[PDB]
Design an enzyme around this catalytic site. Sequence first.
Site, PDB file in Angstrom:
ATOM      1  N   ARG A   1       0.861  -1.222   0.000  1.00  0.00           N
ATOM      2  CA  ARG A   1       0.000   0.000   0.000  1.00  0.00           C
ATOM      3  C   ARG A   1       0.888   1.260   0.000  1.00  0.00           C
ATOM      4  O   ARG A   1       1.423   1.663   1.033  1.00  0.00           O
ATOM      5  CB  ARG A   1      -1.002  -0.016   1.178  1.00  0.00           C
ATOM      6  CG  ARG A   1      -2.082  -1.113   1.026  1.00  0.00           C
ATOM      7  CD  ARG A   1      -2.783  -1.540   2.325  1.00  0.00           C
ATOM      8  NE  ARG A   1      -3.663  -0.483   2.826  1.00  0.00           N
ATOM      9  CZ  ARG A   1      -4.589  -0.635   3.783  1.00  0.00           C
ATOM     10  NH1 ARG A   1      -4.749  -1.813   4.382  1.00  0.00           N
ATOM     11  NH2 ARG A   1      -5.346   0.401   4.138  1.00  0.00           N
TER      12      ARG A   1
ATOM     13  N   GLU B   1      -5.068   6.930  -0.039  1.00  0.00           N
ATOM     14  CA  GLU B   1      -6.307   6.136   0.018  1.00  0.00           C
ATOM     15  C   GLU B   1      -7.516   7.009   0.410  1.00  0.00           C
ATOM     16  O   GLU B   1      -7.404   7.868   1.302  1.00  0.00           O
ATOM     17  CB  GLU B   1      -6.129   5.000   1.035  1.00  0.00           C
ATOM     18  CG  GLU B   1      -5.116   3.952   0.573  1.00  0.00           C
ATOM     19  CD  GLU B   1      -4.855   2.864   1.594  1.00  0.00           C
ATOM     20  OE1 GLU B   1      -5.609   2.790   2.590  1.00  0.00           O
ATOM     21  OE2 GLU B   1      -3.888   2.070   1.394  1.00  0.00           O
TER      22      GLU B   1
ATOM     23  N   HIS C   1     -13.872   6.750   4.268  1.00  0.00           N
ATOM     24  CA  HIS C   1     -15.190   7.233   4.670  1.00  0.00           C
ATOM     25  C   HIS C   1     -15.187   7.502   6.169  1.00  0.00           C
ATOM     26  O   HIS C   1     -14.954   6.590   6.955  1.00  0.00           O
ATOM     27  CB  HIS C   1     -16.310   6.231   4.239  1.00  0.00           C
ATOM     28  CG  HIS C   1     -16.520   6.208   2.748  1.00  0.00           C
ATOM     29  ND1 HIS C   1     -15.865   5.322   1.930  1.00  0.00           N
ATOM     30  CD2 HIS C   1     -17.261   7.002   1.930  1.00  0.00           C
ATOM     31  CE1 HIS C   1     -16.194   5.558   0.665  1.00  0.00           C
ATOM     32  NE2 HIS C   1     -17.045   6.570   0.637  1.00  0.00           N
TER      33      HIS C   1
ATOM     34  N   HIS D   1      -4.555   5.469   7.501  1.00  0.00           N
ATOM     35  CA  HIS D   1      -5.818   4.753   7.239  1.00  0.00           C
ATOM     36  C   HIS D   1      -5.901   3.440   8.023  1.00  0.00           C
ATOM     37  O   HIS D   1      -6.952   3.104   8.622  1.00  0.00           O
ATOM     38  CB  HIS D   1      -5.966   4.497   5.731  1.00  0.00           C
ATOM     39  CG  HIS D   1      -7.366   4.206   5.276  1.00  0.00           C
ATOM     40  ND1 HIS D   1      -7.636   3.624   4.054  1.00  0.00           N
ATOM     41  CD2 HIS D   1      -8.569   4.407   5.869  1.00  0.00           C
ATOM     42  CE1 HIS D   1      -8.949   3.511   3.893  1.00  0.00           C
ATOM     43  NE2 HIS D   1      -9.538   3.961   4.992  1.00  0.00           N
TER      44      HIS D   1
ATOM     45  N   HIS E   1      -8.647   2.590  11.224  1.00  0.00           N
ATOM     46  CA  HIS E   1      -9.510   1.436  11.238  1.00  0.00           C
ATOM     47  C   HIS E   1      -9.217   0.479  12.410  1.00  0.00           C
ATOM     48  O   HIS E   1      -9.990  -0.453  12.659  1.00  0.00           O
ATOM     49  CB  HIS E   1      -9.518   0.726   9.884  1.00  0.00           C
ATOM     50  CG  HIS E   1     -10.421   1.375   8.878  1.00  0.00           C
ATOM     51  ND1 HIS E   1     -11.790   1.250   8.921  1.00  0.00           N
ATOM     52  CD2 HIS E   1     -10.151   2.186   7.826  1.00  0.00           C
ATOM     53  CE1 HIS E   1     -12.326   1.936   7.926  1.00  0.00           C
ATOM     54  NE2 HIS E   1     -11.352   2.511   7.245  1.00  0.00           N
TER      55      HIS E   1
HETATM   56 ZN   LIG Z   1     -11.520   4.024   5.835  1.00  0.00          ZN
END
Ligand SMILES: [Zn+2]
Lengths: 82, 132
Positions: free
Chosen positions: B95, B99, B102, B126, B130
């Site tokens: 990654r 990114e 939401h 990110h 999470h």
């Molecule tokens: Zn996210």
Amino acid sequence: KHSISDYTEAEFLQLVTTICNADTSSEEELVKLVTHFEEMTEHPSGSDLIYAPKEGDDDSPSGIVNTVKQWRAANGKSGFKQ
Amino acid sequence: ESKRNKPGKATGKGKPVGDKWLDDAGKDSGAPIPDRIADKLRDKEFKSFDDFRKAVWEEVSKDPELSKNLNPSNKSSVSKGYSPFTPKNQQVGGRKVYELHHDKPISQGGEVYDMDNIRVTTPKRHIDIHRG
Ligand SMILES: [Zn+2]
């Protein structure tokens, strides 16, 4: 294409030019080439050489090749194929 | 079988941003969608969230105030609708690019295409969001 000693300088410039121009069919292909570049060069800056240059570095394809060539030469690493 | 793959129209205002726009991506909840991008994308229909993502980066490529803080290689990438590469220290394994996140998760009823619910993040940030 397993090490930088497998590439001539001209061949490496080709690889770097492809990356700099995003000349790929998908983002996935581009990410794969960048990962390959970082593995070949062994340079501590990794992809920053291509995408996050330090002030005044030459981030053209030829400039990146020069930065890699010089770093490898000065830090005990094998060079390009004759 | 994924909500994010259902078509919808983009909505929302976004926020004014400056030169440190993508620097903000590695902090807090991430950087907002720029107001200038929201003006261009509002009311357009998208067949998937991935199609919306592509449109965001193509508008970034066209915007002199947003693109001027990307180097030539990252400019080439966003011209093709790809997400641009972050600095190495914000990458995590495979990654390596910014990114879209939401803020209210889609799984908890967050809006897919409301740009006021969308943030730009680095992989490192990110992943941490999470996980709390
Ligand atoms: Zn996210």
